[model samples]
Target: SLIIQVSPAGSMDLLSQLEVERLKKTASSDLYQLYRNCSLAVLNSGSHNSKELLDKYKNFDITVMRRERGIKLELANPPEHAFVDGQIIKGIQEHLFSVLRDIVYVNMHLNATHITNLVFGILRNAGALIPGATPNLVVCWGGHSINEVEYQYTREVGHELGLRELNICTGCGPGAMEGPMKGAAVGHAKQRYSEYRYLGLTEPSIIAAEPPNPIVNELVIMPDIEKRLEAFVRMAHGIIIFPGGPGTAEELLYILGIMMHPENADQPMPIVLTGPKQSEAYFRSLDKFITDTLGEAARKHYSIAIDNPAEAARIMSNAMPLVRQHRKDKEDAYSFNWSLKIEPEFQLPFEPNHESMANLDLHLNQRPEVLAANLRRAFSGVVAGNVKAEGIREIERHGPFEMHGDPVLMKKMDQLLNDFVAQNRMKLPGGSAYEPCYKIV
Candidate 1:
């Protein structure tokens, strides 16, 4: 058990004394609990998900004390991995304060009218909302359990992107998440481009399971998965998809659902789905599933960049000018995609319980965008069952969730999930045999 006190990080510099007194009086409040959980994840970094670790450090506690100029943290019995030479590592200390900064930062704002603006406010407070900046942030989504070959391909694609002066944003886990940032750093160094931005976005529940990797210099902790997804799209000028499991599919569905909306028909967002030669069959299968279930219109939103890193970068770079023009023509902010409309279905937080999973309308009779939204929730449920603590506990208490849907859609969905299991994509490679947390009905 290591005890240490650390200061705040990033643009934050003050806190209300009333807020300080509330925290000191009620250590068990939701805000304190949120800060504690997120801080623990930051300190422990990549190993916060282990059940043993959480149980062994059950006595871990943290507190906030207000100084005349700023606030400080007192960590008791924190994970020892966060320290070396009896002092906290610099990155972890910064991440610790980031938890406090965002938790308090979001609550301090009260005049936001739009959900997108609220998302913007959180990023702005975290120093992520950059105004007058050109389009360069490329958000990459992929499985955390990809193999070495796929990981290397991600690095190549990221290196290509970096050479073109594009920065990398990711989910901030291992495998594909770490690969792009790692390669981009090399590419930036070689090009003598020092203003590199490696932004990582994560939510509270999933952050511990896939903790922030060391390469991530800018991390934003969204309140939930929906906001995290929203942040990715709003801040990104383009998106690159790599080989992944259901979680990856959820991301694909989310963006496609948003793009297919009637209002966004004129919006310019470049999306490329790419991987090495080994993943040819995987991408083909995914394409087939989307086309069969959501129709060709849903498949029209993105292009394929198969086994071609330079081509992926070229496609994104070429598309950036179009995005810049669109933003300018529409009088939208380059810092955020203000013109991109997000419906309530995409903005609202989803709780993935058995009942919610079973009741999702997966039929294709509805509008394509509406159907895509439902399908996105279905996959989101599978993601919860796979990695999230609440979903795992719900599954153990009441068997695998049964998803009822159109027979054709159900067949395609089941086959895609089966392919993921066969490729060791459902769970980390070399772990025990993966178990099904979902069933097709």
Candidate 2:
């Protein structure tokens, strides 16, 4: 019998009786189902998805017991793999607590305040939005599955950022997620910066497939992927992107959609797309994909560099002053970019279902960001098809998702996805047989 007892931390403290009562209702709270599945995800790091990992481990249960003094969790029937001599690993413990913190906070506080204030409150309570702090946090985005050279490029960029004393935040998965944090550790150690922070932002849905990395000192499970994206832009002082698959593509298009907005004309995100010399073709495909789909202005949002980590670090370091000044000029907090205007399209969550995916308007005919938002959704659906449990189950129940868009855009999307298949970005452990998730019409 594998049982581990521990304390879970977060802003879930000081809950009102009304909020606690709502936990009994399945619709209201993430509840036991939420905690149980998320905790299972936290425990099963370094594993990939072919079947429902959470479902297989469904018998494992988590109880949030409220004692007079504080809160303690009773986990029973947890996977034997998560323990050594019946003791939970420290990293998984933190992620387990993270699930407790965010689930309780999002369920209770999600509707408690005004929407903007609510998102900000969630971020604040998790200690993500710090004011008057140095601009060290660089949000790194990439595919969890990648090859040797691509992975190495991610580490070099992380080392560059670390040498300049910049910290990192990733999706908090393996591959691109773990590389920067690992590099930052070496950089932080060399500089003797004891408080070097590795922050990971995730949602339970994604976290189940991609577990939180061991280096993460701060882990935030935003209520949904939209809020998770907001947290990434809100807390990041700089941004570094490495080569990845559809999920990475979705993140890039999402940010580009935001940056393309006229409202965020002066927002200092400092987007950089970097990789090793060997992976130049990878960047070219992405570069072509972005330019052809989003137009030349998309290229303006980022500078692509090959094989120069030191130069990338120097460029990012120089941008910090401008970022600081921009935050001050806008009267926004240094830690969170409150002034960044995200349209309702980007702010809203897009569920990857047949009707939703078919309804997407990818024509250049709509507003650029709006088009980007829909395109972002298309990629998200593709990503969901690739790994997410809901997405996988849906694919099994109803054949592959069907995507229809502008003919040119569909062509480009097909080309890009075909490239991802050729490169094996969608599956685990490399060179696995690939399955198409969408029919482009």
Candidate 3:
């Protein structure tokens, strides 16, 4: 019911008139709706799945406007609460144009780009795509929902990665996402390494849930979670995972499934899972769940790091040469793992509706890699229900999603979800009661 015009500062400079027109056209196509929604989500940070807030400003519309010099924005029915003294918050304003930059880029480059081109689109937008991207890009995965002790442990592992001149990539929200970037920035700053990167690779659905944290100076928004996950693995020289919930588990399974592909049998991707001393039981359960459900061989792809951040860093640092040699041996690019074959199943986006969730192949009679792909879809669906707007709407209308996988795999997966709920790992932590959007039968 209210309209406010906000000036965006920083990397989001003025738009050209033609660009403005392009954005408007995308309003009918694909970009503007996502742009406005993500911008609104960041402005209402610390507010949980605020559908009421979204509906309150249901008529809100934004359009890019251009002049000879630069550009401006036209807003209608925006929330007055998003402003202070009629001026938008600096971070939210920038996030608004961050939305603009990412949406416009996706609208332009998605169908025409290759693996290297795609990674570069995201990295260049973040101002971190180097002419020669080094082996220091370490992708760190963990829960956006985590407790204080576990969060601090993420920072510790980040600090360790930083000490080695390595950079960090994450989902780019709060909790675990912010922690490593925060720690790594300090590590880089201490060494006067201004050339380092703190890359945050996110998609529209996820950015709507987690949004961009202030720590991410280099932010890249992928069009969807599938490409975002793929970008992380392709660009990463080494990967370090901290203790996390369902989403983190999904990431682990995804890469393991990819690695299990015979074509990628020699892909030199390193994965290490770490946590503080208090997370022992949780990590144990996670390891047991993967090994039992996917088979004991599933444990072959990753290492475990318990209460030792430096050791985790040391091992990964030492493995960089092996990564380089593998790339050279395969004639793959050092910047992107071109030879790591991505099956069409992994590349295609899953929109995660209830019907899609219900129809997944969850039984265990197939090849191990194929089984892992099905499990990935199962977790991917829950991720959709928990965070994505479309999936959330489906759950709201139809109640929590229901799955009837093979009893053995379902039991392992169910126990994992139960542990996450008990630990408050499904959503951002705090007082709001968390009801899962999943039912394992």
TM-score on alpha carbons, each prediction? 0.94, 0.92, 0.88
lDDT of 2 by residue, 1-441 (tens): 456687655334655555445444354544757667777777777765453675667677776667665567777777766666867777777777667777777877542125557678887877776665877788889878877877877888787787888888889678888987777788778888887778888887788778886568888888778778877887778788888888888889889988998888888779888888987998988888877777787777889878988777777888988988998899878887779887778877888987888888978577777788888888899988877778878888898999886898888888888988778778766445778878898
Model 2 scores a C-alpha lDDT of 0.78
lDDT of 3 by residue, 43-86 (tens): 66655433445675677778676644444566777656557697
Collision pairs in model 1: none
Please give, for residues 1-441, the per-residue lDDT of candidate 1 as tens digits: 667778665555787776555455265556766667777777777653333346667888888888865887888898887778888777677777677777776656632247677888899888887787898889999988888899999999989988989988888667888889888988888888898889988887777777787568888887788888999998899999998988899999889989989899998898999999999999899988888877888767898878899998888889888989999999998878978978888877789999999878888688877888888888889888888888989999998988987898888889999999888788776555788999997
In TM-score terms, candidate 3 sits at: 0.88
Which of 1 and 2 is the better model by lDDT? 1
Q: Which sequence of candidate numbers ranks them by lDDT, best first?
A: 1, 2, 3
Superposition error at 337 for model 1 (Å)? 0.3
Most accurate candidate by lDDT:
1
Model 2 segments beyond 4 Å from truth?
A: 7-30, 84-86, 111-114, 430-432
